Symmetry: C2
Subunit: 262 residues, 2 copies
Amino acid sequence: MKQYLELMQKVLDEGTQKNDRTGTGTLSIFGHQMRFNLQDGFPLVTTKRCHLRSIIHELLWFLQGDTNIAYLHENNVTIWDEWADENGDLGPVYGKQWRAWPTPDGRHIDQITTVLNQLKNDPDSRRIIVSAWNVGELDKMALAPCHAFFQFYVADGKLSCQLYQRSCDVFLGLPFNIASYALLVHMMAQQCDLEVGDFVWTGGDTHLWSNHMDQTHLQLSREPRPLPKLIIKRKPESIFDYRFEDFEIEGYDPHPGIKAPV
Amino acid sequence: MKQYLELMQKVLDEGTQKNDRTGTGTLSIFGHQMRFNLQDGFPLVTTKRCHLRSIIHELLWFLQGDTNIAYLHENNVTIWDEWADENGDLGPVYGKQWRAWPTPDGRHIDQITTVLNQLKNDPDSRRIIVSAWNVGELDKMALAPCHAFFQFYVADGKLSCQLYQRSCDVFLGLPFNIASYALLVHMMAQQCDLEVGDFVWTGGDTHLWSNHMDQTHLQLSREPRPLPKLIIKRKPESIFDYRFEDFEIEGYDPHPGIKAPV
């Protein structure tokens, strides 16, 4: 997408060379923002072929409050494999915080149900927020959340959402994160009888791995294609009742995929 | 400042009517970002006279971990008076979360000393983060945190910071919030022997109250002046040992102050 390629170019243009614990190195910039009008089309990168299959499963998994990878395995989704422990556990990552954030006094907050109630009953609220950044449980997580928290907004019947992504792998991670949150907005909008508005992406430490430069220059040589259309085939009774098969994308016409190394 | 006035004009151009708790109405947009290179000058609005006085005390107060307004009263700062209960308490807002985030198992995390330790000993960390958004204690707070989450970043010996602000009163609140976090960056930079980098302001629901229109237009009719320079006149031996009198603004020649109703 134009905005996505613009960020890619920006990391090239003004990134600082850094090291990582792994000793691979990054070009990094700090702070960026992009806006995707979801009525323009579903924001799935076209300058390399991306696949929605794992994205959809991961989101459904988040929404169930699951942090064991068993479900992902049921559907051959291997994106979390290197981070899971022997039992398939990741600790209290995303889904657990979204659905059962533990209070200091032994209660649990379902932020997803909270936000639905807010979007329906108090759509003007300036505090419709989900946070995975549970400071008191970070040391229990396989990895501290990268997509750390997000805020919803309603105006003129349209639902928007802004994500703060504290750390972003531009090449591999971001196309996945963008489509994930766009899908969530569509589902939230459908459950609240709202139109889809904007997905706003905000980045903190935003980088390209030094081993993705070859791929990045290829992808930057390509002109974005028009975006596809997302179809949701059914209206489930709740945000927790979507199924993989409920989603179809139509008109997706990307440039060939670009494989990275690891 | 140029970016600040651009934002005012953006809200006039693109803002939609969005009611509120009080029924005054706002013109609102969702998602905005500004970058202030702190090397260029201290980002204190010059198109109306602003004053650091309440800003400094509030920030020293946050850094102390205090959520009772007694300190602010002792220093003739009234900005929190409408929100505090009879005992002067605001509940576990900013200061408590910054200095003593309660974990579910009885510990407290000092996010400020954590960030200090990271900036000094692990400056390339991609999670140098402070969160006020403690989902589990929102029900105890006088108000949900507005400046909810901030992240630091270090490149080439320079300290940057990005704030996420879920809700922003552009005319009254925003100049205050920008200078607040810019001050914090300068303090952290001094304590970590780093140069100041960028302050990145990111907004969620970013609005002008409808009864701020005449004020906004007055201000927009004025040409911004060169940025002032922050003079810190003493280097404390910890981030917690600043004093109100340590800070001076130099070369600040604003347009007249503009009074606006709450």
